[PDB]
Amino acid sequence: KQVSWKLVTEYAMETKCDDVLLLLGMYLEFQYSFEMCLKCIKKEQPSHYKYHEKHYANAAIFADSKNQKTICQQAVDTVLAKKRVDSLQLTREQMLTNRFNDLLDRMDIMFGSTGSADIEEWMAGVAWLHCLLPKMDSVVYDFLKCMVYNIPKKRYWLFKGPIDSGKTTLAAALLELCGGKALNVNLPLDRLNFELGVAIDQFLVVFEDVKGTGGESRDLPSGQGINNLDNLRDYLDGSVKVNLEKKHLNKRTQIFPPGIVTMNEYSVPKTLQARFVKQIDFRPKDYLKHCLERSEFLLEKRIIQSGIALLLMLIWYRPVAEFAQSIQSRIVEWKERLDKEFSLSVYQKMKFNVAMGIGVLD
Amino acid sequence: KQVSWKLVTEYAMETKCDDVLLLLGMYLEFQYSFEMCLKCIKKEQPSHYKYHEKHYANAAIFADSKNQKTICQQAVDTVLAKKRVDSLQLTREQMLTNRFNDLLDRMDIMFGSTGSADIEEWMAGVAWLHCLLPKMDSVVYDFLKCMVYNIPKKRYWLFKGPIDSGKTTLAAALLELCGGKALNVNLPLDRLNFELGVAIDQFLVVFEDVKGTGGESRDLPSGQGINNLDNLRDYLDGSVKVNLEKKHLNKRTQIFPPGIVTMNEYSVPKTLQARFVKQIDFRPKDYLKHCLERSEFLLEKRIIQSGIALLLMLIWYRPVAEFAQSIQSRIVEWKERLDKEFSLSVYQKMKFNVAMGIGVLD
Amino acid sequence: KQVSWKLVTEYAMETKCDDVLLLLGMYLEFQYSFEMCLKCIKKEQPSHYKYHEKHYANAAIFADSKNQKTICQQAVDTVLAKKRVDSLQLTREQMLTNRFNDLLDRMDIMFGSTGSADIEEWMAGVAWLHCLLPKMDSVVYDFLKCMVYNIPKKRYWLFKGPIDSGKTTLAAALLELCGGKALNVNLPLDRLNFELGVAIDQFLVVFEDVKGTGGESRDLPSGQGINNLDNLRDYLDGSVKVNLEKKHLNKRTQIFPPGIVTMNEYSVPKTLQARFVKQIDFRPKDYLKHCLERSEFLLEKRIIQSGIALLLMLIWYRPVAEFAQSIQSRIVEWKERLDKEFSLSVYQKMKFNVAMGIGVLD
Amino acid sequence: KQVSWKLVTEYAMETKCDDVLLLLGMYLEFQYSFEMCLKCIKKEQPSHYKYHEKHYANAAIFADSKNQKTICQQAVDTVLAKKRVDSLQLTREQMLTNRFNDLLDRMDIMFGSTGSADIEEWMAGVAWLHCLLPKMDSVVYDFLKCMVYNIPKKRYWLFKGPIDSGKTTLAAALLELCGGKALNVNLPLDRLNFELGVAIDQFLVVFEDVKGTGGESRDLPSGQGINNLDNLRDYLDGSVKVNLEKKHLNKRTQIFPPGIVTMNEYSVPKTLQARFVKQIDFRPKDYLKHCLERSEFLLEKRIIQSGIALLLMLIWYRPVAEFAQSIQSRIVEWKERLDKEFSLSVYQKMKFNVAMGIGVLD
Amino acid sequence: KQVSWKLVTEYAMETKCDDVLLLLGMYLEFQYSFEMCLKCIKKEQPSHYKYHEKHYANAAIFADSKNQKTICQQAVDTVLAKKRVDSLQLTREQMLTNRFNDLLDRMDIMFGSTGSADIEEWMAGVAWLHCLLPKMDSVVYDFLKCMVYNIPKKRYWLFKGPIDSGKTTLAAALLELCGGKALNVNLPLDRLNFELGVAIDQFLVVFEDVKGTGGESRDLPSGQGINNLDNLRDYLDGSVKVNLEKKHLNKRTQIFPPGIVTMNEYSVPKTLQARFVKQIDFRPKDYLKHCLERSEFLLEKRIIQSGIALLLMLIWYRPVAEFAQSIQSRIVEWKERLDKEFSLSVYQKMKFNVAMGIGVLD
DNA sequence: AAAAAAAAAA
DNA sequence: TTTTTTTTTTTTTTT
Numbered sequence A, B, C, D, E: 001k002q003v004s005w006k007l008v009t010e011y012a013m014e015t016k017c018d019d020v021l022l023l024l025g026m027y028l029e030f031q032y033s034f035e036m037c038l039k040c041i042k043k044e045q046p047s048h049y050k051y052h053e054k055h056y057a058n059a060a061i062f063a064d065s066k067n068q069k070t071i072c073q074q075a076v077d078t079v080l081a082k083k084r085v086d087s088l089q090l091t092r093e094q095m096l097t098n099r100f101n102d103l104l105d106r107m108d109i110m111f112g113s114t115g116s117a118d119i120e121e122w123m124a125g126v127a128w129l130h131c132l133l134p135k136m137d138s139v140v141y142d143f144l145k146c147m148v149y150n151i152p153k154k155r156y157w158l159f160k161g162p163i164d165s166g167k168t169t170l171a172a173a174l175l176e177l178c179g180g181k182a183l184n185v186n187l188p189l190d191r192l193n194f195e196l197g198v199a200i201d202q203f204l205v206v207f208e209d210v211k212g213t214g215g216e217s218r219d220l221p222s223g224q225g226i227n228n229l230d231n232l233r234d235y236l237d238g239s240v241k242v243n244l245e246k247k248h249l250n251k252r253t254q255i256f257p258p259g260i261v262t263m264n265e266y267s268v269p270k271t272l273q274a275r276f277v278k279q280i281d282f283r284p285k286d287y288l289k290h291c292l293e294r295s296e297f298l299l300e301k302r303i304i305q306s307g308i309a310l311l312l313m314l315i316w317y318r319p320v321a322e323f324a325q326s327i328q329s330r331i332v333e334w335k336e337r338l339d340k341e342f343s344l345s346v347y348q349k350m351k352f353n354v355a356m357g358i359g360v361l362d
Numbered sequence F: 001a002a003a004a005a006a007a008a009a010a
Numbered sequence G: 001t002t003t004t005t006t007t008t009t010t011t012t013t014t015t
Ligand SMILES: Nc1ncnc2c1ncn2[C@@H]1O[C@H](COP(=O)(O)OP(=O)(O)NP(=O)(O)O)[C@@H](O)[C@H]1O
Pocket: A132, A161, A162, A163, A164, A165, A166, A167, A168, A169, A170, A209, A263, A264, A282, A283, A284, A285, A286, A288, A289, A292, A299, C152, C153, C237, C271, C274
């Protein structure tokens, strides 16, 4: 009998696997019998125990075949092909709704009876993260609105601020919440081709700590960063399609994703400042440092970096009327699940702990 | 039963897919039965609902295929072969007619019964642009004739005037209607050689924001860009063939594309002045400034800077006999729509409001 | 009869063979008859004599084959796929526990009765290593804990000090203890793209003897390494995923590993200093140099830079409760071996000999 | 009948071809009828006449074959695979013992009755080389131990001195004796990567005539070589595994070979000097110049550059006990041959001839 | 009936064709019937009419092939394989003797009845060349000896002298006589790798007009050549195998070819001067310029640049016994032909004519 | 352009 | 399953 390539493509789509070697490794683990399988008995990874019995028969034949990597390439290209169809067809609010919906599935396994997370720790993160900027919850709502409306020229946000000031923590959470990629532009411009190529079919890009000019008086080293961005004006404004190249593939023409530039106290050119909508001035808070020092779990579990933490903040602070209609049915359940867990009293006490630089949970 | 590669090539040709994964992705959507598929029921995307019912039977056999990427590569290379044949063998009248009737297809999508756009805003965009210059439709129509005839020396147009005079808006609108790209001759003469390579196989080029030399006596930032351009005599004149150098690729010979120079009120050396057939003095108009602050939706959906807005202006103002004989039958239909949806009093009232600095569309 | 590709994949898996030429070379040694093989008779290498008798039948058919490198590539792909599955599925503590089990297997062979190694020479290395830094067992345990707790921005350690101070020595031992790659950032920034790709799925990276600027008056040659490390700040932070590259494979997107920077008294930017949670100042001790001159086996057998020396140090100094549950079984066995072989009296004489700068075995 | 791919691989293994075109070329010579063949009648090249009679039947079928370069590729990859297995599995003294067996096999051809070479001329080369440095045979043995022990940081020797001092002469001899590659690090840092990949799986490297800076006070032109080496001090240490790159292949992680740096009286950094365990100061000797111009056969036959001359120096000067057990049998036999053909009176007169500047054979 | 790949390989080997497209083109024009072939009737190119009548049958089948470049690639790789075998296994005197035979074959064609050359014009070249430099035939014979012997560091010659002194005239003639290529070391140093890769498997190189610095006080342009050449000391030495690089190909290890350096009167560093054996001072001679102005056929037919003019000079002036014994047979019949057509008094009149700037043939 | 890695033919 | 044909990148160029 012969390997069904469709079952492998179905598994790859079901688990959304776009790495050929991960797909090979995952599928090969199905060749052992399910009735004696320790991974299915422990229920470690859902990407195994859901699929093993279904794919066992195909995986035994797959394990004997001579072109295993060809089978996996096609399945991976099917997943990359669906992403390109979705990227070119879907309305941009449906992109964010699909990303929210994926986070909400991922949340339900995190905090479930088979879970391994404490909502009180993650809500202590929400409280800490809301302290970082004045009216952070409203600021995240009009950031999300900005990225959905994607108005040409008026597409990008600038996060300036000192060393250890929280711009990479917020940008990392917004990156996870909106579902983007982080890009490095401090390299020479002709290495930048394939790196800009990673923005292909993504929703946000974050340009992480772009280095400027004139920083030497402040011990801030100079680099190619600002000069690359100020050449890439064709990409930031989105007025036209620019062409993104990636291996084994034709160069996609697309309007480059919107997003976030994160920057230290470099001077920014007048030509470049014209293309950022809003500048958030991050600055270090004395109390927040002591709060984390007395609350190690925030950093160890990466709570303050997480889009799940910012999503929990949007459950708490914004009306249900703001969410997409197909997901409102999930949002109102998670509303009552936070209402049934945190009183406004405990939240205000733990937020006050942050403001005092006391341990948030005290 | 066999997969017909001819049917995939036929879908690719009708849809004009350059991209292997986009073609792979969309063709795999047809594998599901048309009897109940929601994308056909909803009729959201024409690239699916028009084609699924005839490609279903081939898509079922394609979805089982082991060759899938190879099939799509041949189908893509057929569409690229068609482009290279047309690029060498079409006349410029046909090249513009193909971009026009492509835009008429986009208009038929935007303003259809399943539409997503309202013509009242677009006609307000027409009225705004039309007020920007005296006899704007003649300016646009005569520019199109220049680009279509590509007459040596009578080949480039100069846009100059104060800061925020609209020069770059009209250049951006003309770029989409004709097809073309923006070039930056302000560069040092070293980098200019790779910058000019952008012009290969473009129908049109715009020189953006030429920073002239002598004008800083009235605080125009001094630059070399005008004297760089003055040296490029054979690129402007379009008599002889020039050698154009994309970085990492070997030099192509062609007649350099026609174009627009967008400039501030700098002094021009007389031999560079002789190479522009028309100089248009853009000037800032207070009532246009007030109207933009009041009709502000035009800037958000970017109607003001689109080729379809200029094509709507040509359909409104110009007689059908000026359009290419094969597109005339579609211009007939679009004139009747634009008349029946807008009595002249409505457009006149809009143009009056714009002239009065009143943003309301009435 | 035909070659079993499955058996080659089993050999590659059991040998954990990443290299196609190493797999080809080793499997071809099995084509000879095991009844007379000198390497089975002599038991020189375990990757031969454990496996030859099983694989002889298959290897004789493989030796006639025309596919040979294709067979080995699929087997190597299976080993790499297992590494990517484990990388994404396993906890970082289980990764470290698996590495310690690997070293204990190797220690059991190495210090067996067949073993070539003398435990008294290796504990003399543990004595020398413990004299390098104050509280080195605490420093080693703190480092392991820091690499397992992949805490964002608190990920990297800086080793600073003069020539022959012990930075590379300890880094090379920690590199073998945890598993990882040494990267050279002193080379120019364009081909640095493929160096950083060597960190794909690794547990640590060590940035080795990176070169700064200034300090030429101290007779330190300047170089790019620190400026290159002040780029790539997002690789050091690990708050965000970064895109890593192998030839002909597509980009892999992951959090870049934690680890160590070693440098020779250059001026670190404050931007880069903020990425390092600990700076260890290494300091030349003449008694350690004189000890090595009189206990040369430490250098010749590479004892003082081996991960097995640091593991023996942790087995000596740390309580069993600090090791993971799986390996505690094996570590009580190694503790009772060391306490049988060494009383504390032999070891305290070794440390006295090291502090005296005489031969450690005197 | 079909071509045996095995016999081509067996030839490649016996003749040790790294090169696909050399293997193809050699094997196609075996097409022609063995009985008549002029190369076997002359016995000109041993890689022909030892193998043609055996391979003729296979080579006739190979010459009709349609995939010849594919056959030779697998044969070459088998030879490269054995070379990688040997590099990882052999002790470093076994490696040198193998190389000595290969040189002794070449000496058995050179000085047998078929051989083109006169040992009287080669022993006059031993006489000339022994006069170059004090206690040269001790220096050669000390170098061989250093390369065999491969002690971290104690691995590189520096050869230093003026024009025509003898550095490249002794470096080329030691390179042939031990086996290895010479590298030009004077070429710029961006081409340097593929140069260093020539050291993959080699026993020595020689960094030939590297250029420093600040030599114009001596008319020594400055260059990049010493600054390039100091960027590679990670590679000279040999504590950690460096990642080596040859075109299209992914990086191989190995310990960089031990070796020699030869340089002409430039100043060397302290950081780089710490990587050199011994510095040999070469002084030019007037009598060696006058000896060579009257002993021209030494330069024409490349005798003083040869590893066979250094091996004859070790056979003459070193005790039998210093050679590896396996070759002591052959070394005893070669000692008896040299004592038979050379009295000590002939040899000590040769050294007297060298010191007087007389022709060695007078 | 099938295409014989063997007959295509015979044709390639008999033509010595190593260009795949040239082989494809040459073999395809055999597909037309021999009996009416206009190229055979006109005897235009010898590579056709000799081979067409035997290859027609196979070329007809080759025309219907689907794999034509695959066939040609194997035939080209066979010719490259023979060149590489001959490169490693021929003695250099045989290599030169092969080249002289190839030149004598060209001479037979040029001066035979089907030819197009008059020996009196070519012997006027010999007279002109012998007047260029004192004892010119000894100089050429000494150069041939130098290139055949290839003595390390005693194997490059320096041609030095002012503008228009004969340097490139003689160097080009010597380069056609011996075979080899010219190199332009004046490039920027990063392009230099692919210049030097031109020397792979070559017999000579000529470094053409290397430019130094500090000739500007004598109106010589400065350049990078001499400094680049001093980075390549180990290439000029020829003691060690250097690593040579063609584009997209891995590094060949070989001893770099011996050769000539040609330069204007720049000052040479002693490190580079020590690599040259003989410096030949070329001077402008009034009588050679006046003579060429009258005897223009020497320039117009490229006679004085040609190795065939130098080979005739060796046939005239040198004893038969200096030629390798294989070619002595052809050299004696060429001496007899030259003694026939030239009296010594005709040649002495030519030398006397050129000594006075009268036309050689007057 | 040439090779290394990958896919189609019979 | 045996054997031959195909895609694609890297490299190079660029900085
Ligand atoms: N505003 C803040 N005040 C005090 N501590 C903070 C603040 N924001 C973040 N932190 C701490 O700083 C660490 C790093 O935050 P991060 O987002 O990387 O700062 P940053 O502004 O990006 N620094 P940099 O990347 O160097 O410009 C976090 O892990 C917190 O421990």
